[PDB]
Amino acid sequence: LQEKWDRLVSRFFFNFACYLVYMFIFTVVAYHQPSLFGESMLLLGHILILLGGIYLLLGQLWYFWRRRLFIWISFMDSYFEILFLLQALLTVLSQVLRFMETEWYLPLLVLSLVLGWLNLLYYTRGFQHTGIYSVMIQKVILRDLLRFLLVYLVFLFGFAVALVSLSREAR
Amino acid sequence: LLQALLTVLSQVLRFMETEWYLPLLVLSLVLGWLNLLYYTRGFQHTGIYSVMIQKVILRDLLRFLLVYLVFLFGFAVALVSLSREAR
Numbered sequence: 001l002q003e004k005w006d007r008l009v010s011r012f013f014f015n016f017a018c019y020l021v022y023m024f025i026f027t028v029v030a031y032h033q034p035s036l037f038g039e040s041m042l043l044l045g046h047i048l049i050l051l052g053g054i055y056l057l058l059g060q061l062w063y064f065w066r067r068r069l070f071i072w073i074s075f076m077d078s079y080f081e082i083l084f085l086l087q088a089l090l091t092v093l094s095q096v097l098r099f100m101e102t103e104w105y106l107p108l109l110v111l112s113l114v115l116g117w118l119n120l121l122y123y124t125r126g127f128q129h130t131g132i133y134s135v136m137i138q139k140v141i142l143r144d145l146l147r148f149l150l151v152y153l154v155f156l157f158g159f160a161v162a163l164v165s166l167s168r169e170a171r
Numbered sequence: 172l173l174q175a176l177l178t179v180l181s182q183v184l185r186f187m188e189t190e191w192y193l194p195l196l197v198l199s200l201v202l203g204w205l206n207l208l209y210y211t212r213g214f215q216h217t218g219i220y221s222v223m224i225q226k227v228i229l230r231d232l233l234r235f236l237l238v239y240l241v242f243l244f245g246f247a248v249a250l251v252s253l254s255r256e257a258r
């Protein structure tokens with residue numbers, strides 16, 4: 001597997017560079033959105049976003065068709081692909097809401113940008129130090145964070161209702 | 172070396188009477204005060220202390236800074252693009 005990785009690391013970093021360029025183009029267009037030569041350039045950028053989103057969606061759908069049982073077998077090894085699916089369809093969906101000229105095309109684009117920048121952590125498995133780092137971020141800390149969030153949300157809701165009900169009476 | 176040439180360079184910018192001689196002097200002062208930690212190797216307790224400040228914590232801090240800068244830039248662009256529309 002070390003020999004196979006040493007032979008395929010050039011394609012790994014090529015995919016990394018393509019994804020980084022796609023997110024740079026997606027960031028530039030989202031930064032220059034109009035109020036809801038420059039217009040033609042923005043339309044070309046939106047076309048490039050739609051093409052990249054369709055490409056990512058088709059690739060992820062092919063992966064899910066080939067590896068349908070892998071999600072049920074191991075969620076902690078097939079979750080980035082899920083994320084690589086999700087924002088991808090969001091990348092499509094917002095553009096659909098751009099075609100209909102509605103209000104909610106911009107929040108979907110913003111969530112697509114955020115989830116795309118969180119999806120850049122996949123390629124950190126290409127290096128050994130960041131690869132060991134990325135193991136802890138979803139394996140051990142996650143269950144503790146979910147139980148802590150559950151207890152904190154219970155306490156927060158109870159105390160919030162308490163201070164709401166107690167502060168209504170004036171002096 | 173670095174602040175030392177800065178210590179020269181700012182004075183050169185003092186000879187030419189330009190604007191940027193003061194920021195270079197300030198960075199020279201800051202880097203000079205951070206260079207005082209070398210002589211802490213002259214004592215055993217501070218000498219053991221100075222090992223951890225560049226050996227183990229440094230790589231973790233660089234990878235943390237990389238991930239934090241990625242997240243910070245992405246979220247900053249998100250809140251910039253989302254807050255332009257008024258109520």
Ligand SMILES: CCCCCCCCCC(=O)OC[C@H](COP(=O)([O-])OCCN)OC(=O)CCCCCCCCC
Nearest residue numbers: 015016018019020021022051052055056080081084122
């Ligand atoms: C006009 C039609 C052209 C079709 C061919 C385009 C060239 C192929 C692009 C490509 O290499 O896609 C791979 C890249 C990473 O996905 P992943 O397999 O690592 O998935 C891993 C998931 N875990 O995925 C992406 O980066 C998607 C970006 C789409 C635009 C590419 C722009 C290239 C600029 C040079």
